[PDB]
Structures are given as C-alpha cells and as structure tokens.
Amino acid sequence: VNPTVFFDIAVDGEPLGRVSFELFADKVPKTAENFRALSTGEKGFGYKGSCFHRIIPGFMCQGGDFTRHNGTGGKSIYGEKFEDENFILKHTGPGILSMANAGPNTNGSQFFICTAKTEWLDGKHVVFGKVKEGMNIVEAMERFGSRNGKTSKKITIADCGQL
C-alpha cells in the first residue's frame, strides 16, 4: 500500500535518468503524503522543474526548493511548515530519503537522498522513504557535486509523478 513516486533527472537540460522511491506511508503517513502530492503536482505546485541545489559526494543530494530557488524555500501541502511526525526510521545507508529542515518542526518540501549511512542525523531529520530504482542515477548525480555542495551543472527534476 506504500506509494511509489519517480523523478526524471536532467543535467543542463539533457536526460540523466529516473529515480524511483518507496514512501513509507505505513510509518510516516503525513510526511509520505506531502512528498507524494508534491511529486504529482496535484496541489498546483511541487517538485517539477526544481533543482538539486546541494550535492555532496559521499554524503547526500538535497533538493525541493520550488518557491525561492535559492536553497531557503519550498513549502508543504499543509500550508507552510509541519511538525516532525516521528523518528522511527533511521539513516541506515545509501538510498534513504529524509526531510531537510532548519530545526525541530520545520518540515516544508526540501528533502535529501543519502548516499551513505548518516546516523548523526537520526532524531533530527524525519526519514520517510528509500530509493527503489535508479540508485545508479543518484550516484551519477554525485559527479556534479562538490565538497561544499555547489553543483557544477544544473541538476533538475525535469518531470515527476506517482507510479
């Protein structure tokens, strides 16, 4: 019953590949639903056309700012920000999908995809999914990242939706 969504990733406007995610609605339904709806665009806004603004090889890829496009923006389907739903799931390894934030209870739309175990984020960021297919695409994305996260090419979500 867990939903699956996809991102079609582009590099400077040319196709890279598709990353698909399982969303763990069975443990974090509110957080899963936010990501699902932002992926379909059914609220009239969402991830389509937004970029991955911070990519740190060996760590994570971060995106989701569709309002300001400067790493500070984005919003949830619940108004602006929402509470940390729970911290049941941990940052256990490559492929983990988790909410970016600016402290407790500040979930919007920004998210990150781990490429490693990042246990120091446990209890601070809500884990709500995992890459299902296309981890090789996430690994390809890392080539365009850097130590401080600035990307060397424009890495965009050209299209996205629910499977």
Ligand X SMILES: CO[C@@H]1CC/C=C/c2cccc(c2)[C@@H](C)OC(=O)[C@@H]2CCCN(N2)C(=O)[C@H](Cc2cccc(O)c2)NC(=O)[C@H](C(C)C)NC(=O)[C@@H]1C
Our CB check for ligand X shows the closer of 8 and 65 to be 65
Q: Residue 54, interface with ligand X (CB under 6 A)?
A: yes
Q: What is the DSSP letter of 35?
A: H
Decide if 108 contacts 80 (C-beta within 8 A).
yes
Q: Residue 155, interface with ligand X (CB under 6 A)?
A: no
Of 11-19, 21-29, 42-50, 53-61, the segment contacting ligand X by CB under 6 A is 53-61
Of 2-10, 78-86, 100-108, 137-145, the segment contacting ligand X by CB under 6 A is 100-108
Q: Residue 62, interface with ligand X (CB under 6 A)?
A: yes
Query: Hey, what are 73's tokens?
Result: 């923006």
Give the span between the Cα atoms of 39 and 45, in whole angstroms: 9
- Convert 92-109 to b/e letters by CB count within 10 Å (16 or more is b): eebbbbbbbbeeeeebbb
Q: Which of 54, 66, 89, 97 is catalytic?
A: 54
Contacts to ligand X by CB under 6 A: 54, 56, 60, 62, 71-72, 100-102, 110, 112, 148-149
